[PDB]
């Protein structure tokens, strides 16, 4: 609905029970998941009941965390991106252009629509409930007459923006459908020559309304509020920062409507016997603790050590074991009475081992899958493993280099134009040459009244383009063309053939 | 039928016997089964009678719970979702498209029929006595005619609703078939700027009349049940929380026909002789209980540890052993009598490794399943087993795309229309491109006449979408425009070749 | 009391035995092997391995 009155920060700041209760779970399990150098070792120490600092810090150095959860979210989505996700366009409404434009660039991060979907599912798969809501851009004119309000409404681009689960405050949903939803948004004001500002936002999306409440220049506090504030009034006027006042200090909402008729956000919802990481987070957070344990072990029992028995007075004991040390060598035969070579032998440490290679197993195996193929015709399954790695990748650099191209093409001033289709970087496969003979030839085979020319044109260049590589781009152009012109002169004469 | 008395809370809250002595039993499967943030290490403390509480807490810091019993009915959940199930069109009563419009969402989670019905198959899984209700949408409207009644009654959109199991009051069934049913709803009104508020509704669904007894604005207790309520008289008419009152605190009920005919709730009931949780929960609990002693005992002996025997008065021992620290390195020889590195050898944490492997192996027994899969042509058995799981995440996903690209045409104006219908995410496989080229020969090869041409022009999409991947949806929609114009081509050549 | 304060990888201690104790385990895979045969024989009233 329409808001129309400023809030005090208290009223902004509130968030539902469930979320209270449920965001800090989420927060710990997404920390867990992730890794990386966000990890803090304090919160993770088997220490024997606060013993001294000091070794509590040199076992803090030893800190080497394995997130094989980690792994197992890259595995989990690597394997879902190797799918294949389509769109039927005669379904969609309206015009189909305005569809494909939209397609071209899904969000505001450049990805495609199977790329956003994935990237949504393997948010919900670290943590559930991943949110995404759909805006347009904003454009403001000032006598406006109807033709301008025409114009307005019809220069309207919709574009994807995944919302962070830790700025979910509430909202009010059945089912799936969002009836509304209140978040909180922290956007930073850069300036090149001055330091960063920060403006806190509190966004209230509603059935047919969108309301934003800001206060600026304010201060982050430790947790996700606002600290302090910017006041001009303070410092005699010339302004300060102020403790923030939970009652007084109040935003004027700015809103308008969206004309929806619904709520534009989204959320998917992994079903809670398939979220896998619920289950597997303690496990490795105590994979963390036991290999930091593990490891301080093994540093303060590797080393051997050697003693002796001298062979017959302090006095006389420091002459003799300083003589003992500097004849210690291939090169000399000591005197002594008994110089055994002190050593671990090692039993413990391989049973750490065990728990932790037992700790991954559990992880590895909480979803259906196991871990040996990685641990010691029939490697092409390890390397179509591999390949599926190589296509994510590949479609994240295809949508770079169209981007890249893209801007290239305006440099030269052109206008653009189709967006510069570029394909490639999505079949890994050994040996594959012959698999587009084959492919060739079986599309060859294949009644050739029902076969496009579209499709012959492209797979002969698939092939050509896979036969000739480090050529200069004229002579696959070359190449290409050629191609185009026989295969049109085929299909022709194959089709008057037909007709008589 | 129609209810018009308000009813004392410990009429409504009462509850049969059988559910007395069933809910408390299925609430500690559910717990035990589902695992994850949930669980509580004091419930599942194999203590030596009452031990000290520090060591107690020491060893619950070592809780890393491996819900065996989750994974097995995650396997069974995705190998069941691996079926297929198909609803014949032509036996469907009534009009077709209004069934294909339910069809569409089916509940309010927008999930399809067949993740509905796998929803409720787990649900049964994890424990029995799986509830659903069908019910529709309300509209009130004043001064209504003859006119008026008849739109209300052809506006009438059904969805589904999942009833939790430990919401269940009471209920009279003969056989699968149920009479009648009370059960327990606890809705949370949600404030954006204030506390969450709740409500307990009390719903009595009958023969031919559904009731509601509402109490507002109160708090739930540690039973599940009513502790406070708002008063408004209270706090010398100001309104404050009083306990609530057994006999004296009434609510109206609020009753509708539904003209059913009969009770719209359906119960899944797993057969008992297929309800395994039943069987593997103890199991469950005591491998979490087994394995956080396992790990104490582990942390508690796995370190390595050097004594000394001094070679030759406290004081002086005190120096020695000083001097014998410092020099007790690779870089220095020490001339004590006896130095061994005392370790464990460990044959105890092996021994109990064995028996929760025994426990797991149980587990995974009481199904007719082999846990040795994932325990150390040939594999791509394991390979269509992990693609199992990605054609549930798939399925999932697909459903999420639809909701988005439905979200987006409301963006651009359009009224969507036909749902945009989405596919793929289905079939997961090592090498597609020669699987799709095997399966278009082989519907080539087929009679010509007994083959629709909408086959042919899925088949053909399916591989030109497979082939090229990464491009701009314009490519593949020329692509796919090109092939369905030949195939129709070709359809009619030989559609008129065999007419003559 | 000593002893136990400085029985750690971070310490050498100044004792004159100092074995882990630890069971062995030969019975426990016995009643194991037991368990294992009676499920043999429910599994083997039925011709099924």
Not at 386 to 410: M, P, W, Y
Request: proline letters at 3%; a negative charge; one cysteine or more.
């Amino acid at each position: 609905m329409l808001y129309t009155d400023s809030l005090n920060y208290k009223q902004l700041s509130t968030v539902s029970d469930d979320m209270q209760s449920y965001l800090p779970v989420a927060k710990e399990i997404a920390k867990i998941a992730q890794g990386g150098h966000e990890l803090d070792p304090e919160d993770y120490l088997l220490i024997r009941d606060e013993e001294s600092p000091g070794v509590t810090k040199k076992r803090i150095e030893k800190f080497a965390p394995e997130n094989y959860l980690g792994a197992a979210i890259r595995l989990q989505r690597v394997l879902q991106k190797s799918g294949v996700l389509e769109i039927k366009s005669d379904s969609l409404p309206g015009d189909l252009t305005v569809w494909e434009s939209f397609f071209n660039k899904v969000d505001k991060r450049n990805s495609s629509l199977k790329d956003f979907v994935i990237d949504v599912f393997t948010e919900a798969l670290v943590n559930k409930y991943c949110y995404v809501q759909v805006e347009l851009s904003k454009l403001d004119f000032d006598t406006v007459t109807e033709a301008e309000a025409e114009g307005i409404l019809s220069t309207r681009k919709p574009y994807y923006f995944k919302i962070p689960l830790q700025s979910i405050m509430v909202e009010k949903c059945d089912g799936d459908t969002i009836q509304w939803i209140k978040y909180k948004r922290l956007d930073k004001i850069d300036n090149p020559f001055d330091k960063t500002i920060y403006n806190m936002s509190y966004v209230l999306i509603d059935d047919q309304h969108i309301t934003t409440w800001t206060y600026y220049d304010i201060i982050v506090s430790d947790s996700g509020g606002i600290s302090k504030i910017w006041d001009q009034s303070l410092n005699y006027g010339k302004g300060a920062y102020r403790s923030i006042d939970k009652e007084k200090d109040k935003a004027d909402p700015v809103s308008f409507a969206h004309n929806r008729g619904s709520c534009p956000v989204v959320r998917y919802r992994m079903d809670e016997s398939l979220y896998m990481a619920d289950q597997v987070y303690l496990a490795q957070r105590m994979i963390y603790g036991l290999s930091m344990n593990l490891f301080h072990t093994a540093a303060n029992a590797g080393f051997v050590q050697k003693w002796i028995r001298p062979y017959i007075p302090k006095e006389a004991l420091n002459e003799i074991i300083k003589k003992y040390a500097e004849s210690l060598g291939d090169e000399s035969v000591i005197m002594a009475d008994f110089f055994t070579f002190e050593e671990l032998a090692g039993t413990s440490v391989e049973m750490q081992i065990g728990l932790i290679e037992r700790l991954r197993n559990y992880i590895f195996t909480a979803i259906l899958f196991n871990n040996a193929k990685f641990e010691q015709a029939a490697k092409e399954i390890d390397f179509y493993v591999q390949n599926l790695a190589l296509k994510d990748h590949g479609s994240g650099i295809v949508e770079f280099t169209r981007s890249l191209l893209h801007h290239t093409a305006k440099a030269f001033g052109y206008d653009s134009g189709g967006s510069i289709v570029v394909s490639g970087m999505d079949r890994y496969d050994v040996r594959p040459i012959e698999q587009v003979l084959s492919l060739i030839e079986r599309l060859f085979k294949l009644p050739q009244l029902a076969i496009p020319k579209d499709l012959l044109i492209e797979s002969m260049s698939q092939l050509s383009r896979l036969i000739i590589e480090n050529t200069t781009f004229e002579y696959k152009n070359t190449l290409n063309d050629a191609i185009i012109s026989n295969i049109d002169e085929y299909l022709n004469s194959v089709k008057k053939q037909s007709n008589d």
